């Protein structure tokens, strides 16, 4: 079915790689990108056939055939041998389904398309549906359900699809798990693989693909090598399901829901079925309501929230639904009179919505907003071959191929028929209510069936609802002033006679620290920086954390209101705890650096309290606090673990408990204590020059010492944290009970050394050649669990080498399987060829040395090495070139006298997570109780520090 | 003469029963038998002084008491006596005042009849020939060229010599080269007739009182010497004495100006009282003793410190011959106490006029009364040599039974004698004597028998009516009281809990609690020390400098209530750690709750006055920037004390962050730090502990009470550990004194942890070099005089250290130590067993001691809990453990580590150079790179 359109995409010029569209006669929409200059090549398939698009009586159909559309092909029959050729070139495919959508997506190393794309096409000709794949990928399946069974959000969304007509097929059943695909139809003697077999050869190749080709070698060479690999797919003509109106038929509407979740959380849920609009992509009448009701101005809803300490942040908007219809969303935080005075709360609602009927639509945030995406669209930087081919293919459905980038991206009309039209759509008549809270116990009895969340009706008499509709006046509420964070600074600055490739030190004192680099390559008008405060009293004691968590979280809850609308321009910041001191990242435009930063700096130095708010902020993060025995047993031993490898960690029970006795005036007390004496870490990167980082550093030391009087700290007060010796032959544990998971989980750790040229490059390759048969053999092959990990951590300048693995077993038990994957890297170590040893330091070599793809990544990783004081920004030469340098018997020593369990070097350390209840080990060292982990660390070294390069 | 009075006498603690009686020659008899005492000793006095002295010589009966020494009948040899003395460890001495004549002497064990057949023939027959004349004469005018610079001789003379110069307390005691041999025989007189007629008739006549400590028995020697000592006999010697004090109105209201030799300053203020020796049944004059030098609320000194101009006094009842006593007040000077002086009487005739308007007090009396009857309950020992001379001192004046409670108790209460004595303290009866260095061009009259000068300088009349007139209550008050339990000072017996090391019978997250009770001593005492362990002690200079300061101006603060307590007999002591807080409670069982209670209430509720904060503040600064200014090798200390503990707030950052210390930061540091804290606990002596235990709880009780305190994490009761160094290495790095020009330098090695093998390996080599060091290191080659060896306690670390001050190339002293060091390798290979055997046993009587008090064993015992080791029996194990060691095995100690191919070598230097390996260039980067050592184990 070979058919071909195709020009010019419009690619908001910047970017460089090459686009053309095309569309086949099979309903294949070929999307055409040729950047000569890429490094990874992928592409990408998305099919518009969903999960409702599932056949009715099974749900999740296509989901699994494209599962088992992976497996077999008629040329290679193999099973894995798609998968094996990505492993041959270090490909990693995966695909997904939605409620309108099956997309699947693929990469591959630099060129070798045609192998990975012959591989690719051929899915559509003999699936096999053998014993393994077909029964195995089912469990898969059913896991895959199951890890979504607890999932809230994928909770309430398909209760959201079930508390309206079942008998619509929008409340279809989008994932099932075993229990649906191979027990209900044997039971119902239906045929699995019938279905199957229909469902792909009749379903598959009908029309609604859209393909996108990340090619490095033209358009027309790709085109006329694709276009002639793609014509076996032979256009069907399936129809498109759309659904021309809402499952919620007046029988669930005016209605109210209480509803139990799993985590403890309080969240208030609105919900309006709405048409769709997406006809409207020139006018968008939906980044005007998200825009608009989300707003976070003067005389705003969530101002006045604010003012009334309700809601901590909200989202809402027109949330995307079937094909006709979608929804429209408020998801808000509740508090005390959030809970007792909801009636009050809608009130408040309808006053916003008063104010939205008063003035109704505005042309001046349409031109603001079509400014503000403009510009900020035609300066995207690039992309990842994989993800936004993904992502713009799972588009590609709904556009012509020149709209395909400027999808919305760019609006030319104004439309206030629409935004009146779903103004009148927004109506108490119109409403659905759902609220979250945990405490609905012996309250709420019906209960979910799949997931299991209880819930109740408590109908709205009559009295309250026609106060609604009479009762609807505006307040304070008032229109949210134009933006003025607006950018126009967009002016490449050019490159001095200082040249660096990397920051240097431009401004030293005893008071600060002064890294800066100008770009070379991105050439935008962004600049990211990063900055640490150092202090001594930010992890002293409990308290000083608490009271240091909870002022700078009332401060961020300050800050909100300014910073909105720089945020809403392309103007980040953050605020941050560290055990060292408070931690600030601003990443944005050049334009309003200073003016954002002087007013963050102002307002943190001489900063003021409320009461109530912080009385909100206590008790909210005194549930955030015993929130902490919920979670997976695999994080529970990260935790324990990197809180064991340091020198100083308060344990969350202990931080739980200082919180009694925290006052507003200890506090205030505190504050400028804490503010008193500190020092100052920075990073600046983007396009600015050295001397305005100059200046906006010495601006910045300078408000502060003009605030808070702060002085630069000695020498002997700039300190660093340690990391425990092991006694060099130790294998230790202990154990710790989950309540909630019944689940146990496991991390090991192995002390090599510091990162010297020799154990960096020994630990980085051992960690890659215990990587791949870890999962070749214990996640996969023995079938152990689902969390399964291996590999690096260096940590505290010690690196380290670690196992990830959460199963519901006894650790004992879990230990010996270890030891047993231990023997069989042992062997599988020894019997290695030199090929194998040779393409595997090949691909550790290619995996490790790379430029980023945006700016952000590299300052956070320059920055993430700065904190740990390394500096050694020439890692690439002194690693890759100590790497080939290397032979099979050091990694025998690497292993044997120092990693085995047969070692004196043994810096052996496990850690047992116990679940809420509960092919050869050799034998291994006792282990030890450990009752309190202070007395283990009170007679152990400690390490020293790593020398700064 | 064998006459005889006695009769059961009256004596606590003490059960050996003496008694006393008169023989009929005149002789007071005690018998003292005590047949534990190694040396015995015997004592006569006689009540003859230098107021008998002929008015022609000057000094003879001090000469005569001098001649009786040499030479008897039975033994007329020159040291034949001297010999019975140094075969039988004996050493004589006596001398002469102005009514006594006294003798006392020792002997070896039990050589009494020896000693007594000699002593019946000094008396009976002293010979008196040419030759113990003519060299005794050499120690006289020894006696006589001692006081040059005996200031106690030379002051008393000068009081003996400003009075009526025909007044025979003008004469002399002595007897020098002109009143002995220059005024005698130009005026003919013969010296040897006045020395038999003085010694017949005014030596032998009465009044001796023999004492005699013996081990012997009660009745044998009491039988040989009633009859032996008959020898004496009576002819009823006058007793010289004055009915009337000596400075009469010629010298008073007097001024006088004294230059001294050394440089010294004082102001010395006397009054003239009649005879109360009746009146020891109130004793106003040592009552005044008690009023005049207390230092206490209201006191006079007080306001005088206060005023910055006196340093010192004393006061009080000072005794002259039978007839007068004297009343003294005596200061010491500053600079600007010489232009106030007008001033300083003034408060004086303050402080009396307020002493005259409150009148008498029976409170003070009552106290004084019932502290005396304590503290003669409670007496010590005595001295084997003397004691019995001036029991025998006072035996001449008081009955015996009068003779125990001397002046330790108080019959009667006599209102009459103080208003008496009040009346004798006015500005009539003063008189006068400034000593300063400044009088130069100003002192004209000569003394009579130094040759030094002085001069009266009568005031004039402005200022001595002024002095009249102004008579005014003011500020000074009353003293305070602590006499809550006299009766109860109980002895507590040993319970079913006998054990020999404190046991811990009290351990929370808040506090910890560690009890023993004496077995050994059984004393009325206790002991009792207090950690106060809290995080905010260290956190930065700022925080521990106002913690120093904050427990600085507490010690301060305690002080004013604290002083009448500690005139009852319980002692503390505050001074912090560098974890928390550190309290010492110290004294009997009788009152320390309710003292400690107030103790805890005020430090809890604290208090800082402004220009008490400005003189701490200003005078810690000093201190600080003082610190510049000492001996190099503290330099060393100090530093490497920085340079090798986890943590460190150098003094220059302590210096400077006293700019930073307001009231109201201070004010808002005291709850933080007592918000929450921990306690660590000792209590020890002749306790109990369930008490202990309700104690325990006043104590957390009254810390709930005032800060709501509530218990530390335990994951922050740590300790800090000590650096590992890189396993061979020896860097060094320089310091510099800036004031002195000696060189300082410190050597240091680790060896291990406190195990029970390294605490013998280090002391053993230790004391093994050290011998060898005096032979041939400060004797031989005479290095320095700052030179120190031995073991390095610290984080419960070993170490060894080597403190060296000299003026030298940093490693030239460093080469020859270390050529010492090899010195020693092979003065230690070539030892002998002997050597070896006498040194174990040396360091073995070393290391074992008993306990001498609870306070020693509470010391030590404590003194390793806070090093948290608390292995209690190092005792036995350690010694025991360190006599099964040879000479090689200290050598297996000494090649891995300590010699210098050493592959353990920890070696560290610390030079410390004048104001005229590997660097180390920043002592944080130094611990940068470095690993650490572990902790200890509490045992």
Redesign the interface.
Known sequence: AIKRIGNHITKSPEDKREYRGLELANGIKVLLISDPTTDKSSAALDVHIGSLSDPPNIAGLSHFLEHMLFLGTKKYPKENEYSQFLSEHAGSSNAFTSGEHTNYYFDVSHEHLEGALDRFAQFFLSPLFDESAKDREVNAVDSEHEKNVMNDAWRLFQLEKATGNPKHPFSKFGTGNKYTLETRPNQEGIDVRQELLKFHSAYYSSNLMAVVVLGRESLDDLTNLVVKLFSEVENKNVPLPEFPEHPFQEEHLKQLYKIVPIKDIRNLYVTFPIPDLQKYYKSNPGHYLGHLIGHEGPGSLLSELKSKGWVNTLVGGQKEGARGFMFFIINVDLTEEGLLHVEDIILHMFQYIQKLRAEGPQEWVFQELKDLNAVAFRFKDKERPRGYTSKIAGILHYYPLEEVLTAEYLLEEFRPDLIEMVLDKLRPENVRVAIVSKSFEGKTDRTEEWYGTQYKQEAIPDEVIKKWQNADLNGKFKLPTKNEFIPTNFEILPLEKEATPYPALIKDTAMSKLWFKQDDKFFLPKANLNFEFFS??AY???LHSNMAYLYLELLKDSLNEYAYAAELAGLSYDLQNTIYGMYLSVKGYNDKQPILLKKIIEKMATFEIDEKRFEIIKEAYMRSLNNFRAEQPHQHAMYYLRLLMTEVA??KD?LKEALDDVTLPRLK?FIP?LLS?LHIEALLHGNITKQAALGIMQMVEDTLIEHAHTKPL???????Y?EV?LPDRGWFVYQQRNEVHNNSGIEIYYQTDMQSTSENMFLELFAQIISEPAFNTLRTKEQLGYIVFSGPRRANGIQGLRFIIQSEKPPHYLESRVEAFLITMEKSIEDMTEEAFQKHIQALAIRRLDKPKKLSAESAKYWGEIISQQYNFDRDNTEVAYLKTLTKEDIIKFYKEMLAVDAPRRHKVSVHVLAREMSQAPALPQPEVIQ???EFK??????????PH
């Open positions: 001594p009293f002293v004691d409990p308060w344990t202990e007390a204590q004496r000695l020498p002997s007060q700039l300190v660093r340690r010796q309190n982990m202070t009170r007679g152990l070294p400690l390490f020293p520090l790593v020398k």
